[PDB]
Amino acid sequence: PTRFSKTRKHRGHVSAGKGRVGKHRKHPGGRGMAGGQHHHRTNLDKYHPGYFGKVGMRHFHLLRNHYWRPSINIDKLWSLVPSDVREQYLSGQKKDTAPVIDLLSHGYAKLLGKGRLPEIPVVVRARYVSAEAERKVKEAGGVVELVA
Amino acid sequence: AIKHNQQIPNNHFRKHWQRRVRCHFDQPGKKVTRRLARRAKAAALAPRPVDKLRPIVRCPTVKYNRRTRLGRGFTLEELKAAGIPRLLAPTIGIAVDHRRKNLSEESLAANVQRLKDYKARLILFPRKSNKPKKADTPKDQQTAETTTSLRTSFGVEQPLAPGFTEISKSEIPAGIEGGAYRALRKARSDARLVGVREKRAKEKAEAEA
RNA sequence: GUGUGAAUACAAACCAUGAAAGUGUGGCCUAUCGAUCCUUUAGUCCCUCGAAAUUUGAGGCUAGAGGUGCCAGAAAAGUUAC
RNA sequence: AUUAACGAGAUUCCCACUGUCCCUAUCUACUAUCUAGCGAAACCACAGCCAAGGGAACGGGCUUGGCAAAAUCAGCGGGGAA
RNA sequence: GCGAUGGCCAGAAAGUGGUGUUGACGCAAUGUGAUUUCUGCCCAGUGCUCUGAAUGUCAAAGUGAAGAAAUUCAACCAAGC
RNA sequence: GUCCCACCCAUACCCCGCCCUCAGGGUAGAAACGAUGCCCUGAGGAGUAGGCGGCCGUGGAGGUCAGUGACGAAGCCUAGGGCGUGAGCCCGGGUCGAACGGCCUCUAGUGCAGAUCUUGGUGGUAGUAGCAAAUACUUCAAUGAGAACUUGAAGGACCGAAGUGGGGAAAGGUUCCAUGUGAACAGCGGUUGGACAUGGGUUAGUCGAUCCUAAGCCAUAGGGAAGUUCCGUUUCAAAGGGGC
RNA sequence: UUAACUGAACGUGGGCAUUCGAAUGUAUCGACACUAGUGGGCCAUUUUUGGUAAGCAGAACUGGCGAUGCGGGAUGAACCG
RNA sequence: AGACUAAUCGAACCAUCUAGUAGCUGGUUACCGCCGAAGUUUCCCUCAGGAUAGCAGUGUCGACCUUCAGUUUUAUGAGGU
RNA sequence: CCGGGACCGAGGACCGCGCUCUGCAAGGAUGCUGGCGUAAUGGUCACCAGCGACCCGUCUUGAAACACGGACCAAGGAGUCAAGGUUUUGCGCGAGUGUUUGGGUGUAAAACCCGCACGCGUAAUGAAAGUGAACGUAGGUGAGAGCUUCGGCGCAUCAUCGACCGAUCCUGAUGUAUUCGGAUGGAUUUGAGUAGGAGCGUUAAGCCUUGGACCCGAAAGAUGGUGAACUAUGCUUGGAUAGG
RNA sequence: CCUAGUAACGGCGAGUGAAGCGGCAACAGCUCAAAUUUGAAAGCUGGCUUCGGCCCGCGUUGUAAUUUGGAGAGGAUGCUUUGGGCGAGGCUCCUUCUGAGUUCCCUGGAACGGGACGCCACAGAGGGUGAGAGCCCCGUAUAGUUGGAAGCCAAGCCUGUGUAAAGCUCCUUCGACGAGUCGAGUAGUUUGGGAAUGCUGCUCAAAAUGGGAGGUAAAUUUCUUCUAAAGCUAAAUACCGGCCAGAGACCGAUAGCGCACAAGUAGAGUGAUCGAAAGAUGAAAAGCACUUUGAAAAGAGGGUUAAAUAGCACGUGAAAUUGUUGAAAGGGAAGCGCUUGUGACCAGACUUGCGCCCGGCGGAUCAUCCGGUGUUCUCACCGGUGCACUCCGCCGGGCUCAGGCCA
Ligand SMILES: [Mg+2]
Ligand SMILES: [Mg+2]
Ligand SMILES: [Mg+2]
Ligand SMILES: [Mg+2]
Ligand SMILES: [Mg+2]
Ligand SMILES: [Mg+2]
Ligand SMILES: [Mg+2]
Ligand SMILES: [Mg+2]
Ligand SMILES: [Mg+2]
Ligand SMILES: [Mg+2]
Ligand SMILES: [Mg+2]
Ligand SMILES: [Mg+2]
Ligand SMILES: [Mg+2]
Ligand SMILES: [Mg+2]
Ligand SMILES: [Mg+2]
Ligand SMILES: [Mg+2]
Ligand SMILES: [Mg+2]
Ligand SMILES: [Mg+2]
Ligand SMILES: [Mg+2]
Ligand SMILES: [Mg+2]
Ligand SMILES: [Mg+2]
Ligand SMILES: [Mg+2]
Ligand SMILES: [Mg+2]
Ligand SMILES: [Mg+2]
Ligand SMILES: [Mg+2]
Ligand SMILES: [Mg+2]
Ligand SMILES: [Mg+2]
Ligand SMILES: [Mg+2]
Ligand SMILES: [Mg+2]
Ligand SMILES: [Mg+2]
Ligand SMILES: [Mg+2]
Ligand SMILES: [Mg+2]
Ligand SMILES: [Mg+2]
Ligand SMILES: [Mg+2]
Ligand SMILES: [Mg+2]
Ligand SMILES: [Mg+2]
Ligand SMILES: [Mg+2]
Ligand SMILES: [Mg+2]
Ligand SMILES: [Mg+2]
Ligand SMILES: [Mg+2]
Ligand SMILES: [Mg+2]
Ligand SMILES: [Mg+2]
Ligand SMILES: [Mg+2]
Ligand SMILES: [Mg+2]
Ligand SMILES: [Mg+2]
Ligand SMILES: [Mg+2]
Ligand SMILES: [Mg+2]
Ligand SMILES: [Mg+2]
Ligand SMILES: [Mg+2]
Ligand SMILES: [Mg+2]
Ligand SMILES: [Mg+2]
Ligand SMILES: [Mg+2]
Ligand SMILES: [Mg+2]
Ligand SMILES: [Mg+2]
Ligand SMILES: [Mg+2]
Ligand SMILES: [Mg+2]
Ligand SMILES: [Mg+2]
Ligand SMILES: [Mg+2]
Ligand SMILES: [Mg+2]
Ligand SMILES: [Mg+2]
Ligand SMILES: [Mg+2]
Ligand SMILES: [Mg+2]
Ligand SMILES: [Mg+2]
Ligand SMILES: [Mg+2]
Ligand SMILES: [Mg+2]
Ligand SMILES: [Mg+2]
Ligand SMILES: [Mg+2]
Ligand SMILES: [Mg+2]
Ligand SMILES: [Mg+2]
Ligand SMILES: [Mg+2]
Ligand SMILES: [Mg+2]
Ligand SMILES: [Mg+2]
Ligand SMILES: [Mg+2]
Ligand SMILES: [Mg+2]
Ligand SMILES: [Mg+2]
Ligand SMILES: [Mg+2]
Ligand SMILES: [Mg+2]
Ligand SMILES: [Mg+2]
Ligand SMILES: [Mg+2]
Ligand SMILES: [Mg+2]
Ligand SMILES: [Mg+2]
Ligand SMILES: [Mg+2]
Ligand SMILES: [Mg+2]
Ligand SMILES: [Mg+2]
Ligand SMILES: [Mg+2]
Ligand SMILES: [Mg+2]
Ligand SMILES: [Mg+2]
Ligand SMILES: [Mg+2]
Ligand SMILES: [Mg+2]
Ligand SMILES: [Mg+2]
Ligand SMILES: [Mg+2]
Ligand SMILES: [Mg+2]
Ligand SMILES: [Mg+2]
Ligand SMILES: [Mg+2]
Ligand SMILES: [Mg+2]
Ligand SMILES: [Mg+2]
Ligand SMILES: [Mg+2]
Ligand SMILES: [Mg+2]
Ligand SMILES: [Mg+2]
Ligand SMILES: [Mg+2]
Ligand SMILES: [Mg+2]
Ligand SMILES: [Mg+2]
Ligand SMILES: [Mg+2]
Ligand SMILES: [Mg+2]
Ligand SMILES: [Mg+2]
Ligand SMILES: [Mg+2]
Ligand SMILES: [Mg+2]
Ligand SMILES: [Mg+2]
Ligand SMILES: [Mg+2]
Ligand SMILES: [Mg+2]
Ligand SMILES: [Mg+2]
Ligand SMILES: [Mg+2]
Ligand SMILES: [Mg+2]
Ligand SMILES: [Mg+2]
Ligand SMILES: [Mg+2]
Ligand SMILES: [Mg+2]
Ligand SMILES: [Mg+2]
Ligand SMILES: [Mg+2]
Ligand SMILES: [Mg+2]
Ligand SMILES: [Mg+2]
Ligand SMILES: [Mg+2]
Ligand SMILES: [Mg+2]
Ligand SMILES: [Mg+2]
Ligand SMILES: [Mg+2]
Ligand SMILES: [Mg+2]
Ligand SMILES: [Mg+2]
Ligand SMILES: [Mg+2]
Ligand SMILES: [Mg+2]
Ligand SMILES: [Mg+2]
Ligand SMILES: [Mg+2]
Ligand SMILES: [Mg+2]
Ligand SMILES: [Mg+2]
Ligand SMILES: [Mg+2]
Ligand SMILES: [Mg+2]
Ligand SMILES: [Mg+2]
Ligand SMILES: [Mg+2]
Ligand SMILES: [Mg+2]
Ligand SMILES: [Mg+2]
Ligand SMILES: [Mg+2]
Ligand SMILES: [Mg+2]
Ligand SMILES: [Mg+2]
Ligand SMILES: [Mg+2]
Ligand SMILES: [Mg+2]
Ligand SMILES: [Mg+2]
Ligand SMILES: [Mg+2]
Ligand SMILES: [Mg+2]
Ligand SMILES: [Mg+2]
Ligand SMILES: [Mg+2]
Ligand SMILES: [Mg+2]
Ligand SMILES: [Mg+2]
Ligand SMILES: [Mg+2]
Ligand SMILES: [Mg+2]
Secondary structure, rough: OOOOOOOOOOOOOOOOOOOOOOOOOOOOOOOOOOOOOOOOHHHHHHHOOOOOOOOOOOOOOOOOOHHHHOOOOOOOOOHOOOHHHHHHHOOOOOOOOEEEEEHHOOOOOOEOOOOOOOOOOOOOEEEEEEEEHHHOOOOOOEEEEEEO | OOOOOOOOOOOOOOOHHHHOOOOOOOOHHHHHHHHHHHHHHHOOOOOOOOOOHHHHHHHHOOOOOOOEEEEEOOOOHHHEEEEEEEEHHHHHOOOOOOOOOOOHHHEEEEEEHHHHHHOOOOOOOOOOOOOOOOOOOOOOOOOOOOOOOOOOOOOOOOOOOOOOOEEOOOOOOOOOOOOHHHHHHHHHOOOOOHHHHHHHHHHHHHOOO
8 A cells, every 4th residue: 555655745845855965876885795804794793693604514415304203292292181080180080091092102202201290100102212201201100112 | 785683695696597487377277277187078078087007116215214105006016916917907997107116015915905805896887788798897887977087086095003002901022022122232232243254253253263 | 781802710630739628720910813605634433425235435423724914804997188 | 320303291592573561541342231022050047237246266147336218230259157 | 030831811610711823033021211421348137049968846538555345655757947 | 460349132941831751649439431541740852874653645355334326427627615733635616528435453565855777758948050062044935822942035155076975884773754743851941852642654586594513612522520410522332324 | 729628619598677878859660673864074162283364174072053932132054032 | 000891990780698886976746743962982994985983863661769960169199291 | 998990791590608697799790771784894815005924845963045856737656465473452162273285055256054184272301312280278478459257268470499301510329131230318400380271263553584675876797689871991893084 | 587787708998798507397208320131022012903912114223020229139047018899887079858926006209217016046148129138039157857979088897828929037149320421721701609609601630439519729647427420209488460258447430450330442543552421310200291372493381200400411409600589789990907886687695583561272291209111329210199270382462682784
């Protein structure tokens, strides 16, 4: 919508808000990233510290599928089971049955452990598991088993 | 010419991009054309389904390894197990792929069952009405409700494994002796040292002799 | 209140000197000097070559040197009276 | 370094000759000039009398004075920083 | 400067052209500028030109040695300088 | 030079009225209110470059005024009126002839004095500069609305055979001849014209082209070039015509 | 850290307002976000450098013109109100 | 003679690439209300130009925090005109 | 304590502070009287008079300038559009969020409906192999709006001392494929991290970049074509120039 | 669509930049060289022919059948499979036909406008007709209907048959597979391709479980995956240049293409090429008969028309500039600001309103009560009852209050 913009309010005022002494010429200072090392250095060092240089070794023909392993913390583990069944376990009505969670079927490969876990035994099947996550699931009565 | 705290721009607009711009104002017009072509094709194939039968296939990468999908055609070994001639398969709606192999036995068994029940559901009209043959339908059950999609009626039943399972307590297994985390570290370092360990053992045998 | 040069006070090691308290992180104080890319040497015994091993070769990580004197650092000779 | 002949080439002097000059005067033809018919262009912020002052340090316009009477024809080259 | 298997010159190339229906009293490239009388000294510098015993410098290919190989190191070495 | 009385006037200071901006308060057992409203109190106002807010106009789109109009819509002219601080809005009179507005949202090729700006039109200068090379015209009669530059006769002059004479090549293309004619053109006039309108006119065995070759150009045999095409003219070719 | 519960920093508990310990003002408190124009300057009192001097060149504190009319200096960007 | 090559020559004319680039000249369209500048610091083949800090506007949030100040008074330090 | 003159009249039931207290000069003007009821008061336009008043736009420390553009009038005429960022405003859903590449359907380029994948977000840190976030009621101390049983509990945010994950530098337990493994405890080090999630889609404005980029403007450079009717040089074939 | 502005390239400066996997649209597969028909070149161009065939030629330096790596060949073994001809009925193209007022009155030159009364509608899209028309006319909506031509698709029937040819299950053994090519060195170009991704020139020049690829050069030892140097083939995709059609929050004669018109035309240049200006009388020409002045162009009368203030210089007809008539000013510029005066012209406002008292005229109906209905449930309307000191309208007389302008 052009009916309300600052160009309509500039009618009748010479120079259209760009100044008299500085007249808004074509391209003062250069085009694009010109002057990175010569006259735009002061801007390119106060912000963007690190534009120039080489760091690290290079990799030819990287395939990102080799590096796919999404992770999930341990405090969100109970959120995988459906709500109706979930409330039964926390309320304490089963007392004799344990759930078996399959992380791969939900799209996870590594089980990290960050929060706390209630004292109910579970079984977790993961491709990878952290050292701290294995201890917390074990002290709750459960066990974690690798599945590949 | 940067002036403030900005993100460094990279806009690939220095060629003559204006000469190659592809606007899509014919999105609804093209859709009408395809629907006219589908129903025209379905009319030509009056009692036949529009599509063709496909097998079940697993994706080839470690990511996507879990899911399954439809393939291109049945291997020559799958057709032989179900007792279907190679030449007769393409002419009754079955798709054949001659450059695929059955490395495992799970995939071979799954596809054979998926192809065997299709043969039971097939109605085969005779070439000439006045003289039927042994393999033809005997005209008594030619009148029945039929399907035409064959992609929804024969799609993948479930692509992923069930989300979870529920088992009684005292049936939970015991883990690896060392533990799950340490079982991975040991298995990783064993492959790293497979070469160093092998030559040291071998040269010892020659050193003593 | 960015960089380079130079400077002050401690901490953790190893030493010199003196009977000892102490003093010493270059010249009694104020000047005496140098980025990115590339090359080269020192260091650990370390990481990668992406189908798997073993030795050559190559690439990385940390600290110095080769230089820009127009010294916050392009590679550069004249003439026009047509 | 000299050199006969030749030159719409540069330079100095002498004889003849003359309005170049002392020093200007007169005559003829075609215009300019007046009339009938035909009939353009450059240029133009608005415009058109001066003296001093101050001012972007040389005014047609501002300040203080001089002054100042319709409408017009033929000439002229001081000014309009024409 | 040149005796034709050649000198000067044109063309992207060609079983292609110009001088040339020509052959040194000829063709081609430069400086001075009728006749008369004359035209001195300098080869250090910058060019041009001549003679290869000299080994100094020295490319690709080829030859020799080391290595499991990629590769590295040695002699030899046209013209020009 | 020094001292003392009275008086004169700035958009400054004091008091009062009105406008806008900013700040602080009051208003529901609602007899209540464009609550974005109304009522009470105090202080302030200069401004280029620049920032933000509120409003007015133009061409189109959705909704709505059960809107105006051949008993006159839009447009244009008008030292005739009313409203707003202002851009602007509204009415009266004259001319004219078929479509056009108000209000809330949507949309953009949306507002001019300048750019030696673009296209078209018109002025002052101005009835002014000027229409002056090639020696030159005059009397009577006829035609006609009208005669210096149309026609006849008679005088006076010029070009003076390297001509203002008599015929051609290049180039032009009907300008050649007859009859007739309002405007336009012939930088004055015009009955006259190389102008305008209607008709007519160019005859070859002997004059030229046609035939032959010159400098030169282009096919063929062959060789180059990715190719449009370049070289080659007797060249490393099985190349022709005469009689019965 | 000291011969040393001797010190050193940070603390629990308790005591001290009857008056929170100079004047005046508070017509303007603290923090954050995004961005415009500008980066040729010039004049005056006091201090002051080069120059014979300049309506010349170069600086320090503050006030002005630029960006600003109004009343006085007849006139006059900067002087007085 | 830098002469001539269609009024064009110290490199002809016609179309296209082409709306060739410009730190440099010129222009940039209605009204009212409120706030209101800079020619200075550091770096750049930088000095007719840019980036950086300052001066400026708008949008707000934290409290109405009793905090603050281009100022005086009292006590106590530094300086070399 | 008594005279003389000028300018002004805001507000619109009662309420208040008071006094000289059957009332009043006390929170803002009323009373009496005359002429005329139309061009009389008032308004528009033209002219004379007193005072004031240099030509606009633009660059500039300084313009009325002897600085530049402009003779006059009418119509045209200059910050736009797309992709990608960023902060702020409105709206939907919220540990999630986004239907429209595509399919179903239709009164047919509209509207309505469906889901597998995928993008951004939910976890960081190293060049890399790799590893991967709770001692405590998710901590202690000083300020904090609001609430409160009056004792206290204390959101957002600011300062300060600690704890946990990755990297870097030390220490090297039990064990053992006797060279592998890396527990535990430290360090004036380091990160765009953890410490009771805040993001995703869309709307509107300012600003930034590349694109013709607010509009008009060079002296040049390149690709492919047309000219010897002028003039320059040469070739084949013709012509012309008194008398002393 | 996503991967992805990612791995990588780059005076590592300005800048540049793919692929595998994943979801969808659309789906379809095949024949040659290398074998001896060898118990029979079984194959083909051409010419003639009565239509049955004959003749010459091509070809053994290889024409048909058989085989193409998925295999296949050669053997075993029992079952199965295969030709011709009709054909309802349905779908595309052109062509015949399709509902309802010119009813009545007013304005007007002419109703298609205003008012009254009707009708049609699976048809109220659009245009014409003397001004805005669903019913005056062409068309528009719906399935049918008249007639005709040629190809497709296909329900289901009627008939031959194993000399031949084809498919499946097993096996000791056999199992031919593309050369100046692949690969290597060197040079130039190019790419995200980095001790060299593709391409081309020159030198060298292979092999049989061989050969290529596996994104860092080299040697030794394993592993995975395909089969190069010969060939064919629909759909999903691009495009408004050619022939047609339907549309728009597009422009409205200096705009929109250079061209709404006898526009790539007139005109300019030796040539390549450059390239405009220009739409509108009225519903209908009814485009001015006749008279008179003039040499003529034309004028003055008189006519056509709703209008000639529409006369082929034609709808509306603005500004710059000009003519006539009327008003005013002027001693080397004019214009303009503040404030009076003179002359000309002009908008408002005022011209009565309310209340009380007396008299007169005219009407039905004020308080009250009963029945019915509504509603905010206690306030009203309608019907009846009143019947003159009440209520309502008008006229005449008297009085109070207020109302325009300047003082
Ligand atoms: Mg402004
Ligand atoms: Mg400007
Ligand atoms: Mg600027
Ligand atoms: Mg530099
Ligand atoms: Mg510092
Ligand atoms: Mg420093
Ligand atoms: Mg020490
Ligand atoms: Mg010393
Ligand atoms: Mg260095
Ligand atoms: Mg470098
Ligand atoms: Mg490896
Ligand atoms: Mg590899
Ligand atoms: Mg270097
Ligand atoms: Mg420097
Ligand atoms: Mg550079
Ligand atoms: Mg001499
Ligand atoms: Mg001589
Ligand atoms: Mg004269
Ligand atoms: Mg005259
Ligand atoms: Mg003067
Ligand atoms: Mg002077
Ligand atoms: Mg003067
Ligand atoms: Mg002047
Ligand atoms: Mg005067
Ligand atoms: Mg003069
Ligand atoms: Mg002038
Ligand atoms: Mg020769
Ligand atoms: Mg010489
Ligand atoms: Mg000479
Ligand atoms: Mg000579
Ligand atoms: Mg001589
Ligand atoms: Mg000599
Ligand atoms: Mg010499
Ligand atoms: Mg010599
Ligand atoms: Mg060599
Ligand atoms: Mg040599
Ligand atoms: Mg005042
Ligand atoms: Mg005031
Ligand atoms: Mg428009
Ligand atoms: Mg009208
Ligand atoms: Mg009309
Ligand atoms: Mg515009
Ligand atoms: Mg204009
Ligand atoms: Mg302007
Ligand atoms: Mg013009
Ligand atoms: Mg003119
Ligand atoms: Mg004259
Ligand atoms: Mg003449
Ligand atoms: Mg003359
Ligand atoms: Mg004359
Ligand atoms: Mg003459
Ligand atoms: Mg006549
Ligand atoms: Mg006569
Ligand atoms: Mg004459
Ligand atoms: Mg003569
Ligand atoms: Mg004569
Ligand atoms: Mg002669
Ligand atoms: Mg003649
Ligand atoms: Mg005649
Ligand atoms: Mg004439
Ligand atoms: Mg005439
Ligand atoms: Mg005539
Ligand atoms: Mg004639
Ligand atoms: Mg003619
Ligand atoms: Mg004869
Ligand atoms: Mg002849
Ligand atoms: Mg002939
Ligand atoms: Mg001949
Ligand atoms: Mg030729
Ligand atoms: Mg050839
Ligand atoms: Mg600067
Ligand atoms: Mg700046
Ligand atoms: Mg200056
Ligand atoms: Mg500047
Ligand atoms: Mg001055
Ligand atoms: Mg100075
Ligand atoms: Mg100066
Ligand atoms: Mg001032
Ligand atoms: Mg003054
Ligand atoms: Mg004075
Ligand atoms: Mg010269
Ligand atoms: Mg020419
Ligand atoms: Mg010329
Ligand atoms: Mg040239
Ligand atoms: Mg050109
Ligand atoms: Mg432009
Ligand atoms: Mg240009
Ligand atoms: Mg203001
Ligand atoms: Mg202010
Ligand atoms: Mg300038
Ligand atoms: Mg601020
Ligand atoms: Mg001193
Ligand atoms: Mg000192
Ligand atoms: Mg008041
Ligand atoms: Mg009056
Ligand atoms: Mg004056
Ligand atoms: Mg100047
Ligand atoms: Mg300025
Ligand atoms: Mg000015
Ligand atoms: Mg001047
Ligand atoms: Mg200037
Ligand atoms: Mg200038
Ligand atoms: Mg001018
Ligand atoms: Mg103008
Ligand atoms: Mg004028
Ligand atoms: Mg305009
Ligand atoms: Mg955007
Ligand atoms: Mg998601
Ligand atoms: Mg990682
Ligand atoms: Mg509190
Ligand atoms: Mg832009
Ligand atoms: Mg050019
Ligand atoms: Mg160049
Ligand atoms: Mg010629
Ligand atoms: Mg010649
Ligand atoms: Mg002679
Ligand atoms: Mg490259
Ligand atoms: Mg590229
Ligand atoms: Mg895919
Ligand atoms: Mg035949
Ligand atoms: Mg077969
Ligand atoms: Mg049929
Ligand atoms: Mg009909
Ligand atoms: Mg009538
Ligand atoms: Mg009607
Ligand atoms: Mg009509
Ligand atoms: Mg109609
Ligand atoms: Mg009708
Ligand atoms: Mg092959
Ligand atoms: Mg090759
Ligand atoms: Mg190339
Ligand atoms: Mg290459
Ligand atoms: Mg093909
Ligand atoms: Mg129009
Ligand atoms: Mg046009
Ligand atoms: Mg026109
Ligand atoms: Mg227009
Ligand atoms: Mg045009
Ligand atoms: Mg022509
Ligand atoms: Mg017209
Ligand atoms: Mg007439
Ligand atoms: Mg007559
Ligand atoms: Mg009319
Ligand atoms: Mg008439
Ligand atoms: Mg008309
Ligand atoms: Mg006219
Ligand atoms: Mg007209
Ligand atoms: Mg006029
Ligand atoms: Mg005079
Ligand atoms: Mg004046
Ligand atoms: Mg007056
Ligand atoms: Mg009643």
